Amino acid sequence: GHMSRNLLAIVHPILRNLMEESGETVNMAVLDQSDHEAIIIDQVQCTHLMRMSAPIGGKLPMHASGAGKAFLAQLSEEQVTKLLHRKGLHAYTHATLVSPVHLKEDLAQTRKRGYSFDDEEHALGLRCLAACIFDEHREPFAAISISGPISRITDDRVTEFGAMVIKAAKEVTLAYGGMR
Amino acid sequence: GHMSRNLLAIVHPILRNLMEESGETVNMAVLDQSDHEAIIIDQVQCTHLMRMSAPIGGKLPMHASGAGKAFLAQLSEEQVTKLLHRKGLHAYTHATLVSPVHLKEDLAQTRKRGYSFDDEEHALGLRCLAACIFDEHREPFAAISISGPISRITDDRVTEFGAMVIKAAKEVTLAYGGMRGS
């Protein structure tokens, strides 16, 4: 399953409402079946002077972004062992997870809490929270992320932000389910 | 002084060089002399995912931005003293200089170091450095600013960025002198 012009049309106001609720830029991405990077297909930017402003069609790293890790978290142990064996783990920053054990631990916690969290792993001062959108085969065919600076996505708000992105991704999975 | 598209085209390379050298978004703003405001009229954004991305036509506060304070620094003490007697100043953040004493201090230091510095005074987590551009009558009409997050514009880079923007502004000034009215 996937999107879809009428689906993107449903998705867009969900993204709009999420920007307004979170105060940050929101992205929707799909997965590149390899390199397992997430490609941005839609976005609603916030109006803060400083903000996340990746371009539409921009690609986020597999192991090192909210959207990338959200997708990656849905794969089996052996699937991820094979992808890490193949692609390696480019260090964007000193926080990037470059150890398989550390990455796999973070993926485990991502499944548990319902959102991925990029904590300055792609770029210094940048945080993102993401959740996958699922089809009828429980395949993640898209992910929404909320992306913004550490000065606003503060530690005391991470859980709250995670809740917001869960709810947005859920609304899209439901919307897809409805249109069928 | 007067900016046209053609003049913007002519100085664009200076702005693009500054964005590349600083790694941050570069803005050029003009002073509205009627309404005393700083209006962004061009911009070269950096390629960082997180970056300053004000729109063209955006306004920056006189007392609380790099471009605004660069303009204020050019005014006589009497001129600042008066228009600040007016006249309350909006507090964008806890760092916004809303005390006339404190603002005037900062403007003196601006004149001395050659560049203004907005240290989270417009928005939390945002720094800018700016310097004025002068027309053929040596009148300030524009300002160029480097604007970016405190994650990258760190204390050890403030002086160096100040230097970059002074040099850039002087290059725009020279280029404008050579192409006035284009």
Swiss-Prot record, chain A:
Listed under GO biological process in this entry are:
glyoxylate cycle; negative regulation of DNA-templated transcription; regulation of DNA-templated transcription
- Mutating L126D leads to what result? Loss of promoter binding and tetramerization
Offer a single GO CC term for the protein.
cytosol
Q: What sequence ranges are listed for the domain IclR-ED?
A: 7-178
Q: Which UniProt keywords apply?
A: DNA-binding, Glyoxylate bypass, Repressor, Transcription, Transcription regulation
Q: Does the keyword Zinc apply?
A: no
Q: Which GO terms describe its molecular function?
A: DNA binding; DNA-binding transcription factor activity
What's the effect of swapping M52D? Strongly reduced promoter binding and tetramerization
Amino-acid positions noted as binding glyoxylate in the UniProt annotation, renumbered to this chain:
G66, A67, D118, C128, S145, I146, S147
Q: What assembly does the database describe for this protein?
A: Homotetramer and homodimer. Homotetramer in its active, DNA-bound form. Homodimer in its inactive form.
Please tell me what else the database record remarks about this protein.
Answer: Glyoxylate and pyruvate occupy the same site.
Role: Regulation of the glyoxylate bypass operon (aceBAK), which encodes isocitrate lyase, malate synthase as well as isocitrate dehydrogenase kinase/phosphorylase. Glyoxylate disrupts the interaction with the promoter by favoring the inactive dimeric form. Pyruvate enhances promoter binding by stabilizing the tetrameric form.
Q: What is this protein called?
A: Transcriptional repressor IclR
